[PDB]
C-alpha cells in the first residue's frame, strides 16, 4: 500500500511556459485557452500590493510570450477570472483531454504535476488539508503547476499552484481562480489557520492496513460516535459524521470490522500512542488516503 | 520531502496488453518490438515447473494477441531473452521515446507505472532493496508493468514486474534478468534478509545539513573499511566506491567530507538518536537517493 498518483500523460500534453517581462511561470493549455496565475503580469515591485485590474488593462496581447515545447503560441486575447489569467491563443491544443474544472473539498486528494519552465518534473499525491493548505513539493518557478484527478479518461482539474507559506506548506486556487483558504496573491508572509487531522482518512488507512495483513492495533472495545468525536476534537482531529461512517461501509464490510470498532482502535492509538510500533511502514498516523483511494488501490 | 515519481506520459504511450490463450499481462512497445514476461505462454499446468524452451517451440506468431487498446498489432516474429519474451510487430510505435535499458543497483530509486490490461492505473516511486525486492502496490494482472527513470527526456527502463509471500515484489530488468535470486515459477520464494540502504541514509543526512539541521555532525572521521565493518553489525549495507562517488555532489555542496559524514552516521548507529529528530523524524530514511535529494533541494 503506497501513495499512488494518477498517470500524468494527459496533463503533460497541456503544460506550457508563460512569460511576461521578467517573470515566467507555467500555464495550462486547453483548447485555445492558456490558464495561468495572474501574478505573471507583476514586476518585483508590483507584487507587494498589486492592483490587478489596473495592471492588466495596461498590458497588450503581444506582452505575453507563451511557449509549448519550442513553438511559440500567439496570444490573440486575454481576460482575468479571479486569480487566474485566461490567454486566448490562435492554436487549439490538439492533445486536450476530456476535462472538467472542479473545486475539491477538504480531505479529498489529488495528483500534482510539478512543472518548471513549462516542463513536467514530477508527480505525487496531495490532500487538501482542512485548513486549505497542501503539503507539496514546489520550488521557484513552480507556479501554474496543476492538481487533478482522473476518472475514465476525464481529467478533473482542481488546483493551480500559487505560493509557499513560511511554514513550507503550499497554497493555490481552483481553475476558476479562487483560492482555497484565506490566502491572497500578494508577496507577503501569510499564516494558515490551525491545521487538523482528517479523521475519516486515518480510519480508511487503518482499514487499508487490515486489508494488507496488519491487525496489531485492533482491540475488543467499541465507542459511540459522540464519545469518539469528543476525544477526536480533543486531539485536533476533524469530526466524524454519519456520512463518513457510511462512506467507510465497504471497507468495514470487506474487513468485517464495524466502523465504531475501528474508531475505538483509533481512540486507543490516540490515547496510548504508537509506542514505537509502525502501521504500513509509518510511525505516524497517516491522513492523506481517502476511503476511495483505499478501495481504488 | 515527498516521494516524487517521474511524469509517466512517455511510458504510458508504450503500454500494450499481450494475451496467450487465457493469460493476459502487460507489454512494452518500443519501435517494432513488444517486451513482456515470458510466463504469458504458460498454462495453469505449466507454471509450477515450466520448461520455457519446449513451451516456446509449440508457439507460433499467430498464437500471440498484442493489443494497443482494442487495436490488434500483428506479430511477425518471437524470441526469448532470459525471462522476457520479445514479440516483433509490424508497426513501429510512433510514441517511442528516446530510451535505454539499464540494470540498476540496490538503493537506486525508480518510478513504477502500474498497469492492467495495457491500461496505466497509477504511478509511484520505489527503491530497490539490498535483497533485490521492492515495496510495490501490484494486483492480479500487473505483470509486465515497468519501472523507469527519466533524464533529459531519455527514458531508462530498469524494471519489469512476482509478489513474494511477504508481500514485497520481484522482477527483471528489460533483458529478462531477475534482480535477486528469484525465478519465474509459481512457487513460494523468499528473499534474503534485508538491510538498510547506507548510501541513501547518508544522502538523507546531507539533506538535513542543507536545511540547517546538523546537530549530528561530529568531530570524527573514519576509514571506509572501519565504517563498513561497523555498518554490518547494525544491519546496514557496506559502502562501495561507487556510493562514495555518487555522494560527491552533496559533499561538495555542504563541505562535509563523505568519510566525515560516515563517522557521524557511525556515532548515530552506536549511540542512537537520544530522542532527537532529524528533518522532523525519529527514523532515518533510506529510500531517497543522492539524486533524489539534489532534485528536491
Ligand atoms: C511561484 O512560482 C511564482 O510565480 C512561486 C512558487 C513558490 C516559490 C517557492 N516555492 C513555491 O511554491 N510563488 C510565489 O513566489 C508567491 C507569489 C505570490 C502569489 C504573488 N509568493 C510566495 O509564495 C511567498 C511570498 C512570501 C513572503 O513575502 C514577503 C514571505 C514569506 C513567504 C512567502 N511566500
Ligand atoms: C502477474 O500478474 C502475473 O502474470 C502476477 C502478479 C502478482 C499477483 C499478485 N501481485 C503480484 O504482483 N504474477 C504471478 O502471479 C506470478 C506468476 C509466476 C511468475 C508464474 N506468481 C507469483 O507472484 C506467485 C506465486 C506464488 C506461490 O505459488 C504457489 C506461492 C506464494 C507466493 C506466490 N507468488
Residue numbers in the entry:
A (entry chain B): 3 to 299
B (entry chain A): 3 to 163, 165 to 300
Please give me the paper's original passages concerning this structure.
The details of the interaction between M pro M49I and PF-00835231 show that PF-00835231 interacts with several residues, including His41, Phe140, Cys145, His163, His164, Glu166, and Gln189. The results clearly showed that the ligand binding patterns are not disrupted by these mutations.
The recognition site of coronaviral M pro depends on Gln at the P1 position, and no proteases in humans share a similar cleavage site.
